[PDB]
RNA sequence: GGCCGCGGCAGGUUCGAAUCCUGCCGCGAUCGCC
């Protein structure tokens, strides 16, 4: 329970047991007696040929390597051919490059296709890099393995760990690429409490330096950047957690966090002391990819929000639900009702020009004077925030999102009240207000 | 394929528009991000 005590006492969680390690080292047995019986030149990569994957997520990526002048087709038909005839049950879904998701004696297995280069300079596609990716790493990561199994096992019990939209956080390769500038986890923990938007973080020369933005560049790849999807929001979480981290050790920083399940009674109490409008736009779930669907759902968010916002209806904050079925856009407002009064700027009293067209215009009430310029009371067509959005999401559905503002054009509706709380978003509400438990 | 960052046109809102909201085309070459 002291300061250094924690970090052995966490490996138990983030260290594989060994009984996964026999799952693990039987199914990559199994497949390259079949990769080898279809005489393909494959490469092991990922987390589990360096062994720094973390207990309970067991998954093997395996690269296919072929020659320069096979086209795009034929590396993508051949590619996934390879994959389906190896894996016992497959699945096919990809979005950037074709791979194969599937099962390999109860173990997840991902094959994906990419060229075989030469020095890492000129590269295709962008699956080109993990080759160079693992011959860089294997070689110096060897040894601190466990080192990278307590920071991502640390950024993962936060859910700051995946790199997709889902999450906009530190890649594994980001993790790999930390543990062996900074050798250690503890180490590494310290000099990221110093990060600032602007760090530049060049692990090939061993130098930080100071930039336009967060910037890891690549030992591979000196204009790429390895963080370039972390978020500005996580870096900044990631920043404090590892001040509170170093000031107050505990072992709960590794520890998956509550559902903080919410009964759909209290959340409703917590609505009413908070005074604030609460609803949704619920609609069907685009049958799509997450990387496809959540940087949709954001701009949909986030194009309501700047709606709400430009209305006067005073939005506090914008989160997002996706379940099996329905997505959620959740949003909490300020006001509940606003006026069917405003007051339109008009010209000044100066050039009459302007003033007799804005003078022109029917009105229900007389327009007037104030410091020296022409205004006018003009009427809403809308009240309530929810009638608002209800308006805007008809007329501008597709702007929301190429696959999500058409689902929206079909059928979408708003809940409000309690007719919100008993749908699967409550963990999401309670985040976006912070109610702690 | 989706998203994002810019650039160029064509509209709409408006008294008018540099702001604001849409539509289309183009750029992204360690294939901007997955
Ligand atoms: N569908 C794909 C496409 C590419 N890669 C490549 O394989 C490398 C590592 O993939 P990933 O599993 O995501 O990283 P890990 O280190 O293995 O993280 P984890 O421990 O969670 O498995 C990356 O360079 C990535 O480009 C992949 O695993 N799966
Ligand atoms: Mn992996
Ligand atoms: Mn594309
Ligand atoms: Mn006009």
Same mark, same amino acid.
């Given at each position: 329970?002291?300061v250094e005590?924690?970090?052995?006492?966490?490996?138990?969680?983030?260290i594989?047991?060994? *009984?996964?390690?026999r799952?693990?080292?039987?199914?990559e *047995?199994?497949?390259?007696?079949?990769?080898?019986?279809?005489?393909?030149?494959?490469?092991?990569?990922?987390?589990?040929?360096?062994?720094?994957?973390?207990?309970?997520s067991l998954?093997?990526?395996?690269?296919?390597?072929?020659?320069?002048? /096979?086209?795009?087709?034929?590396?993508?038909?051949?590619? @996934?051919?390879?994959?389906?005839?190896?894996?016992?049950?497959?699945?096919?879904?990809?979005?950037?490059?074709?791979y194969?998701?599937?099962?390999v004696?109860?173990?997840?297995?991902?094959?994906?296709?990419?060229?075989?280069?030469? *020095?890492?300079?000129?590269?295709?596609?962008?699956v080109?890099?993990?080759?160079?990716?693992?011959?860089?790493?294997?070689?110096?990561?060897?040894?601190?393995?466990?080192?990278?199994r307590?920071?991502?096992?640390?950024?993962?019990?936060?859910?700051?760990?995946?790199?997709?939209?889902?999450?906009?956080?530190?890649?594994?390769? @980001?993790?790999?690429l930390?543990?062996?500038?900074?050798?250690? /986890?503890?180490?590494?923990?310290?000099?990221?409490?110093?990060?600032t938007?602007r760090?530049?973080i060049?692990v090939?020369?061993?130098?930080?330096?100071?930039?336009?933005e967060?910037?890891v560049?690549?030992?591979?790849?000196?204009?790429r950047?390895?963080?370039?999807?972390?978020?500005?929001?996580n870096?900044?979480?990631?920043?404090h957690?590892?001040?509170?981290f170093?000031?107050?050790?505990?072992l709960?920083?590794?520890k998956?966090?509550?559902?903080?399940?919410?009964?759909?009674?209290?959340?409703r109490?917590?609505?009413?002391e908070?005074?604030?409008?609460?609803?949704?736009?619920?609609?069907?779930?685009?049958?799509?990819?997450?990387?496809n669907?959540?940087?949709? @759902?954001?701009?949909?968010?986030?194009?309501?929000?700047?709606?709400?916002?430009?209305?006067?209806?005073?939005?506090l904050?914008?989160?997002?639900?996706?379940?099996?079925?329905?997505?959620?856009?959740?949003?909490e407002?300020?006001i509940?009702?606003?006026?069917?009064?405003?007051?339109?700027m008009?010209?000044?009293?100066?050039?009459?020009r302007?003033?007799?067209?804005?003078?022109?215009?029917?009105?229900? /009430?007389?327009?007037?004077?104030?410091?020296?310029?022409?205004?006018?009371?003009?009427?809403?067509?809308?009240?309530?925030?929810?009638?608002?959005?209800?308006?805007?999401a008809?007329?501008?559905?597709?702007?929301?999102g190429?696959?999500?503002?058409?689902?929206?054009?079909?059928?979408?509706?708003?809940?409000?009240?309690?007719?919100?709380?008993?749908?699967?978003?409550?963990?999401?509400?309670?985040?976006?207000?912070?109610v702690?438990?």
């Amino acid at each position: 329970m002291k300061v250094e005590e924690i970090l052995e006492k966490a490996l138990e969680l983030v260290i594989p047991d060994e *009984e996964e390690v026999r799952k693990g080292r039987e199914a990559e *047995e199994e497949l390259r007696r079949r990769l080898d019986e279809l005489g393909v030149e494959y490469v092991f990569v990922g987390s589990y040929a360096r062994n720094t994957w973390l207990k309970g997520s067991l998954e093997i990526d395996v690269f296919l390597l072929f020659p320069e002048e /096979f086209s795009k087709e034929e590396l993508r038909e051949r590619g @996934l051919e390879i994959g389906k005839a190896v894996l016992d049950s497959y699945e096919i879904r990809y979005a950037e490059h074709p791979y194969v998701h599937g099962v390999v004696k109860g173990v997840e297995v991902d094959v994906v296709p990419c060229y075989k280069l030469k *020095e890492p300079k000129n590269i295709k596609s962008a699956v080109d890099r993990t080759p160079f990716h693992h011959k860089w790493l294997e070689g110096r990561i060897k040894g601190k393995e466990n080192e990278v199994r307590l920071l991502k096992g640390f950024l993962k019990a936060n859910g700051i760990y995946g790199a997709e939209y889902k999450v906009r956080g530190f890649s594994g390769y @980001l993790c790999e690429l930390l543990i062996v500038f900074y050798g250690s /986890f503890l180490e590494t923990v310290k000099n990221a409490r110093r990060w600032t938007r602007r760090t530049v973080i060049d692990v090939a020369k061993g130098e930080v330096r100071k930039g336009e933005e967060f910037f890891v560049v690549d030992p591979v790849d000196e204009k790429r950047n390895v963080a370039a999807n972390l978020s500005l929001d996580n870096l900044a979480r990631f920043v404090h957690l590892c001040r509170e981290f170093m000031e107050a050790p505990s072992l709960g920083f590794f520890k998956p966090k509550h559902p903080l399940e919410i009964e759909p009674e209290r959340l409703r109490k917590i609505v009413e002391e908070r005074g604030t409008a609460v609803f949704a736009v619920k609609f069907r779930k685009p049958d799509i990819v997450d990387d496809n669907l959540y940087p949709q @759902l954001e701009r949909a968010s986030r194009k309501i929000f700047e709606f709400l916002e430009r209305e006067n209806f005073m939005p506090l904050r914008s989160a997002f639900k996706a379940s099996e079925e329905f997505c959620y856009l959740l949003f909490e407002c300020q006001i509940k009702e606003i006026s069917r009064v405003f007051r339109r700027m008009g010209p000044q009293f100066e050039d009459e020009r302007n003033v007799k067209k804005f003078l022109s215009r029917n009105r229900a /009430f007389r327009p007037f004077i104030e410091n020296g310029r022409w205004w006018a009371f003009e009427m809403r067509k809308f009240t309530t925030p929810e009638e608002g959005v209800r308006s805007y999401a008809s007329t501008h559905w597709h702007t929301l999102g190429k696959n999500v503002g058409e689902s929206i054009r079909e059928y979408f509706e708003i809940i409000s009240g309690e007719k919100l709380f008993k749908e699967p978003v409550t963990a999401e509400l309670c985040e976006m207000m912070g109610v702690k438990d």
